Design an enzyme around this catalytic site. Structure first.
Site, PDB file in Angstrom:
ATOM      1  N   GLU A  73     -79.437  25.971 -82.020  1.00 46.17           N
ATOM      2  CA  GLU A  73     -78.543  27.087 -81.710  1.00 46.17           C
ATOM      3  C   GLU A  73     -77.212  26.582 -81.158  1.00 46.17           C
ATOM      4  OE1 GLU A  73     -80.195  30.038 -79.066  1.00 46.17           O
ATOM      5  OE2 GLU A  73     -78.487  31.383 -79.320  1.00 46.17           O
ATOM      6  N   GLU A 131     -71.600  26.844 -71.765  1.00 47.43           N
ATOM      7  CA  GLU A 131     -73.007  26.456 -71.651  1.00 47.43           C
ATOM      8  C   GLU A 131     -73.224  24.993 -72.015  1.00 47.43           C
ATOM      9  OE1 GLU A 131     -76.033  28.980 -72.802  1.00 47.43           O
ATOM     10  OE2 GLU A 131     -74.984  30.802 -72.169  1.00 47.43           O
ATOM     11  N   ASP A 181     -76.060  32.825 -83.212  1.00 45.82           N
ATOM     12  CA  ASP A 181     -76.150  33.867 -82.185  1.00 45.82           C
ATOM     13  C   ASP A 181     -74.822  34.626 -82.114  1.00 45.82           C
ATOM     14  OD1 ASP A 181     -75.558  34.897 -79.461  1.00 45.82           O
ATOM     15  OD2 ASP A 181     -77.584  34.184 -78.958  1.00 45.82           O
ATOM     16  N   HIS A 192     -72.618  34.126 -78.900  1.00 50.09           N
ATOM     17  CA  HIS A 192     -71.985  32.809 -78.848  1.00 50.09           C
ATOM     18  C   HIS A 192     -70.932  32.665 -79.938  1.00 50.09           C
ATOM     19  CE1 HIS A 192     -74.511  31.380 -75.694  1.00 50.09           C
ATOM     20  NE2 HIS A 192     -75.617  31.606 -76.390  1.00 50.09           N
ATOM     21  N   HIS A 218     -79.832  35.413 -83.775  1.00 50.72           N
ATOM     22  CA  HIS A 218     -79.863  36.136 -82.497  1.00 50.72           C
ATOM     23  C   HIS A 218     -78.761  37.173 -82.478  1.00 50.72           C
ATOM     24  CE1 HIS A 218     -82.070  33.068 -79.653  1.00 50.72           C
ATOM     25  NE2 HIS A 218     -82.903  33.750 -80.422  1.00 50.72           N
ATOM     26  N   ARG A 221     -72.857  40.881 -74.520  1.00 54.53           N
ATOM     27  CA  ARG A 221     -74.287  40.548 -74.553  1.00 54.53           C
ATOM     28  C   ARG A 221     -75.193  41.728 -74.201  1.00 54.53           C
ATOM     29  NH1 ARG A 221     -76.646  34.413 -73.121  1.00 54.53           N
ATOM     30  NH2 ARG A 221     -77.844  34.331 -75.087  1.00 54.53           N
ATOM     31  N   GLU A 257     -81.586  39.444 -78.707  1.00 58.99           N
ATOM     32  CA  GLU A 257     -81.556  38.640 -77.501  1.00 58.99           C
ATOM     33  C   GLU A 257     -80.407  39.120 -76.630  1.00 58.99           C
ATOM     34  OE1 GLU A 257     -81.701  33.923 -76.599  1.00 58.99           O
ATOM     35  OE2 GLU A 257     -79.834  34.739 -77.475  1.00 58.99           O
TER      36      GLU A 257
HETATM   37 NI    NI Z   1     -79.260  33.123 -78.645  1.00 56.73          NI
END
Ligand code: NI
Ligand code: NI
Lengths: 269, 268
Positions: free
Chosen positions: B149, B155, B182, B185, B208, B214, B243
């Site tokens: 991912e 991060e 994702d 992201h 995701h 989010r 997610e």
């Molecule tokens: Ni994710």
């Protein structure tokens, strides 16, 4: 309807030069005779340089319409219904590699002997295992198309008839799996071949031809006339692929005789 | 394509009863709302009882499609690029245990934060260490499938984009490793998300979804319409896993909103 030729190739393991030589010889032969595509069979595609194969296909303007997988069973013991789940998983992983090659060429992936045999089990269990493996293959692939080839009783006790395969297609319920009917096998296993093909109808995705003795079409006693009348009736417009022994007279002669027999059948409908 | 829900679970080394409670609640919610599978995340699998999880998955007829591993990094400091080889070895061994669990369910193993950061090293040194650890995982496991991912810059400084990940997949050279994209992201790191997804193509193994903030898809400003148009174009038939933060309104409401938003986009 289009005509293709199945070409035999040495395993590349082994003798890479022999594989390449066989492939080029077969493709040049197919082009010379007039075939519109070729069909191949490979045991393990991970050991072949497919970029070189693509270049050859482009050079000769000769697509690869289908890829056989049966040597994965005959040589390596891999079966999609193997009682050992470890081997079942390895069989699925092998066939995924065939689908990666198929994606380069837009080819069908043939499910023949790689499906495995009953091995002392109920037909029902063997079928359920097979359906699970095929559903896994569909989950693992986004573009691959598969064809199930019914085979005669001496080769397997699992999926001998078109009806056997149709029952399985109804359970799998995916248009990415169809039927490969083979006249040599049908000559033994089907009661009425025109009726069998009508039942297949839209599910017939690919077609293998060889005469009753598996020689070039025209050199046995199989009734191809009734078959091609039926293919016209059901609107079949995909490949008719010559899968025969190099008889009579060798690989070249057989491919020529086959082509002539089939051209006459096709043009006169 | 298929819809799944990521469910948060307590660490069972800390409270095994809470883990089971969290898992059942989450799976019952997923089934109730209409999700086809669930996705979980566990720090250390060797302390959970998976048999029961399997019989729990059994009675709800609800597969587990993916297992997250990031807590092995955040809590235990385990990294597949740790400069300390002894800790790197322990990280590999931990992820091997995750693959044993995943194999019970036919699930994917997620390589997110467990891959580690550059920690002052070059991108190249970090990358080669990662490739080495991944090749070791492929040697130690036979059928396990991993998904990398890409994560945003806050991060990690190692694998931020889909193109990053694709370059590394080519060096690993195994169909047992693919990409998990994702949308939260990607909203930060990808120039053009449809173009990035098309480049990923068949190597996009898992997905995701969460909105730009989010929250549940539908509750920010992310363009899911273009994403799902692209997923259809490339023939994506794998999982789309929610997610997201339990927002708005908690875990249940968020799961409900997300499902409503995504089902409509998939159907049409
Ligand atoms: Ni994710
Ligand atoms: Ni055949």
């Amino acid at each position: 309807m289009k005509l293709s030729l199945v070409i035999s190739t040495s395993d590349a393991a082994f003798d890479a030069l022999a594989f390449k030589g066989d492939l080029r010889k077969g493709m040049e032969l197919a082009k010379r005779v007039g075939y519109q595509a070729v069909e191949i069979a490979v045991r393990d595609p991970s050991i072949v340089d497919w970029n070189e194969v693509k270049i050859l296909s482009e050079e000769l303007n000769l697509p690869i319409c289908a890829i056989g997988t049966g040597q994965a069973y005959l040589a390596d013991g891999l079966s999609l219904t193997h009682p050992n789940d470890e081997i079942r998983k390895k069989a699925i992983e092998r066939v995924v590699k065939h689908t990666e090659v198929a994606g380069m060429f837009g080819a069908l992936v043939i499910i023949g002997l790689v499906r495995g045999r009953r091995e002392g089990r109920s037909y029902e269990e063997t079928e359920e295992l097979f359906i699970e493996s095929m559903k896994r293959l569909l989950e693992l692939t986004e573009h691959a198309k598969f064809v199930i080839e019914p085979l005669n009783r001496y080769e397997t006790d699992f999926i001998n008839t078109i009806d056997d395969a149709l029952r399985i297609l109804r359970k799998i319920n995916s248009n990415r799996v169809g039927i490969l009917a083979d006249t040599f096998h049908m000559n033994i296993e089907e009661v009425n071949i025109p009726e069998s093909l009508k039942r297949a109808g839209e599910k017939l995705y690919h077609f293998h031809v060889a005469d009753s003795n598996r020689w070039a079409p025209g050199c046995g006693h199989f009734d191809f006339r009734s078959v091609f009348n039926t293919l016209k009736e059901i609107g079949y417009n995909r490949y008719v692929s010559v899968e025969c022994l190099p008889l009579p007279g060798g690989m070249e002669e057989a491919a020529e005789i086959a082509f002539k027999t089939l051209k006459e059948l096709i043009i006169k409908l």
